[model samples]
Target: MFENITTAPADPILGLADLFRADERPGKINLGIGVYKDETGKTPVLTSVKKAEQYLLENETTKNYLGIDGIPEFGRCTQELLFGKGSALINDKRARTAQTPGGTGALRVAADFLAKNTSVKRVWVSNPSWPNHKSVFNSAGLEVREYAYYDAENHTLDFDALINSLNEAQAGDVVLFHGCCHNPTGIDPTLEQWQTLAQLSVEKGWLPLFDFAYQGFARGLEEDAEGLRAFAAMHKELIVASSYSKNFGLYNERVGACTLVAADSETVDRAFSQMKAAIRVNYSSPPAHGASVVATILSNDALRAIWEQELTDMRQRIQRMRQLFVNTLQEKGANRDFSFTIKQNGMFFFGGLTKEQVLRLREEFGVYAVASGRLNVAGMTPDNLAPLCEAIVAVL
Candidate 1:
């Protein structure tokens, strides 16, 4: 078995992480990983999470398994967070949710479910999606297809091309959409465009699978969840894979949920039953800690308020960095219009660095970022902005 396996190419994002760590440069800047960092350049444990963990510690609890579906509170809370509070789907029993390992796990479960259960042979992912989207679905024996997205030449959305491709997708085909804070290329469809997607999905019968990795990190929590809520309102048979990794700072704990909304109550019940079976066959259950922490925070008004404030702070800081970085690039004599970076929402802005320029950045400048030119703008701290900007200018 070992002999049969050959070395595969490194994951571009994660590989940059390893390279960043191994470099001995004292002033080395790491903008590769998707993880959010504070203004101080640290991924701190959120205060609200700390309090929740303390509550868990104080309360006498059993260490038994949480079963395949995980905590009910977590599942329900996560569902509400993804869907709105007064969503008809939630009240009508059309929407049901289950806990999973994390965003990736939810995605894997969705992929496996689609592979074994649905007629979805090919999954349409946005062009320039996160690298793992392809590998995860392909590993589950599904053909991964790319739709038009991320206008490389213009560094913006190719909405017309995207809508055209989505229109061409067959009924029951899975269309994986980034619900918020699009990865690799931080560009997102306008609200008008998302409305078009919802209409298209409803008309074409394409299954919408939203990978909602960064909800609150993009805007206010409710604001970021707008697309999911809108789609859920229009289409009943949509799939949502939501993560607490970015918002709740639950990256290591792998907290996520998959909400399946069917056309009707009976169908939802049947689909959830099937999903539970799939869960039983797969990992059996998700971890308890992260989801529980998230649930506690969301359920408690005080904790939820604290979390909201922190989330806003993080979002605003990233926006600040985005402006600063773009301004620095402009000051560097680059003839291009860097103003678009300000318009781009999320912790990352597609810097549009060529692969060769990216390599030069890593090798010559000791400045690490995703080779695809995706920089974790949250990783741009006060300390590293100068060097990071200088390296980017040099590369340009």
Candidate 2:
């Protein structure tokens, strides 16, 4: 039985990470993974997270396992952070949340719950979305479908095509949205466009499942969530999978939460019970330290301030990288239309390179990128930008 099983291919994004790791080449650059790197090209832990961990280490008592849904306050903090303080949904108990290992875990839990409990047989994702969107859903036995999203040639959101593509969705179908920072494309809908989609979801009866992995990386925390919050206003029932990996620098800690909005508190209660069951069978309960640290940081005023400031710095640096890369590319005499990248928000911008070019970039210049040409803008530093651009120019 073991002999018959062929080897599986490596994950597109994570696969590149593996390849980059073994390359002993000095000054090799990695733009494949979605992990955020500071201007120094390191994924540093946030000061708030370090402080929170210190507090936990000092005041910790026992290592008792948390409930299946995780620390109760973690769920509360998740809702408050997602919907803002004193939101009507929180006050009325119309939304429920649970801590998970990471955004991926939250999504897998969502997939399990929906597949087991709901009538949603199909999960609609963007044509070019986070690769794991399909991987997680399909792994949980859900049929994965796609809707149009990016217009690569023109480098803009194909709004009408997206709406038309999603028109086939039936009531009770699940549509996964990026919530913000449209992952591979880095293009997000305008508030007006988001309103239209929300209205359409309501009219069509498809459920919206949001994957919010990079909360503060696009704009301000509040600004980044405008699309999700807008969806909340117009749609009665929705699901969100949020990750603190990028914003809180809790990547290894696997701190993330799933928040579900129901039509009413009663529905929320019922749905939450099933969500807990999904968690119980998957990993029993999420590991405690990450959620505890997140709670600690978000709870204290000073820690919260520090976290927010750090998040802001991360966002601003990414923004600066986008401009700098474009400017440097222009200066290098690399002729192309990349201004559209500046309009896009978040940690990533589409590189618009083919798979062949991507491989060449990796082999010839020691710069790695995904086949789809998605680059993590946050990975760029002043030190690396010159060589990185030279590699890109050579590949082009």
Candidate 3:
């Protein structure tokens, strides 16, 4: 019966991981994935997360499901974490939130919700966005298009072209934006530029849908959320999909939330009901373990403090890796200037290498990265920095 099925192409990102693992080279470096690793080249579980888990394990509780919308506390805490606790929208009951399996799940739920609740039929994403963005939205029956984002050759944000393209979007259209730490290319717009976009959103009457997968990885938590906060303040209605997988290192747990901003409490209630129905039809409800861990840490002052410090350390380590890479390339007598890398934020960098260069780097040197030259900065360590830089310089 299934003989007619043809083999599908391997996933661009995960396929790199498979190839890297199978390579027999002893000095292989896998920079294809975006998970954060420490200086020792390990993805350690956060201490706060461990503690939270222990607390949950000790407390008396049943394994009952959280229904379609999931835990209310998780949603409330997540909403506050993304937009401040004192946010006027939350206080006025204009915001509605629901826990999801992961950020991708949140995006899917939001896509279906938009398809059902809003008049918008089109969604615009960055030209070089996370590959899954197109697949997820398109899977939900929405017309997907791209807007100018990163200038790969110049290693900078293409703001003028981005603004011009966004200006073309009609009213009631949905524009998907990276809330912080843009994927594939780590380049993010300045706060001033974000404010300008917010004003433009107001003028165009377009709903901004923020994909916030790396909240604390760029700057600090509050600082990284400036774009989302700016839009939340300016626009009466918006969409946000947030992930705890990166910041909390809870990748396996798949904790995330989808939120919508409505004009009033009545509208928010109506929208939330629709969102819950969407979730019910899709996956029924999100898992409990990860969201519970997040809620526990966020609710406790001391645990929250520890989690913040740990997050800061992770951010600093990635920044340090970025610096080491650029400096090492210069020290190796490479003529090309790579200082733009230091200016870019978050875990990944669009290394500006051609497809041929990336191929050579992998096949000849066992240094794996996306064909588009996107690499995880956190994948580098002091021990491996020299060789990684040497391989890059060789490719260049």
Weakest lDDT window of 10 consecutive positions for candidate 1: 329-338
For model 2, what is the C-alpha lDDT against the true structure? 0.88
Q: What are the per-residue Cα lDDT tens digits for candidate 2 across 1-396?
A: 698898898898888878999999998998878888987788888889999999999999999989888898888888887888878888888998888999999999999999999888999999888888888999989999999988877888999999999999899999999978888888889989998998899899989999998887777788888788888887889999999887888899998998889989999899999999998888998999999999998889999999898888888888999999999998887867677889888878785678898889989888988888888888889999999888888777
**Descending-lDDT candidate ranking:** 3, 2, 1
Which parts of model 1 have CA positions greater than 4 angstroms off?
none
| TM-score (all chains, Cα) for each model | 0.97, 0.98, 0.97
lDDT of each: 0.84, 0.88, 0.90
Query: What's the lDDT for candidate 3?
Result: 0.90
RMSD to native, candidate 3: 1.2
lDDT of 1 at 268: 84
Give me the runs in candidate 3 sitting further than 4 Å from their true place: none
Candidate 2's error at 27, in angstroms?
2.1
Which digits, one per residue and each the tens of the lDDT, describe model 3 over residues 1-396?
Answer: 998999988888878878987899798998888898998999999999999999999993899878788888998998888889799988998998889999989999999988887788899999888998988889889999899987777888989999888877999999999998888788889999999999999998898999999999888898999889998989988889999999999998989999988899998898889999888888898999999999999999999999999999999999988888888999997879988888888988785688999999998999999888888889999999999888888978
* Better candidate number, 1 or 3, judged by TM-score: 3
Candidate 2 worst ten-residue window by lDDT = 332-341
Go through the candidates in order and give the C-alpha RMSD of each one to the true structure: 1.4, 1.1, 1.2
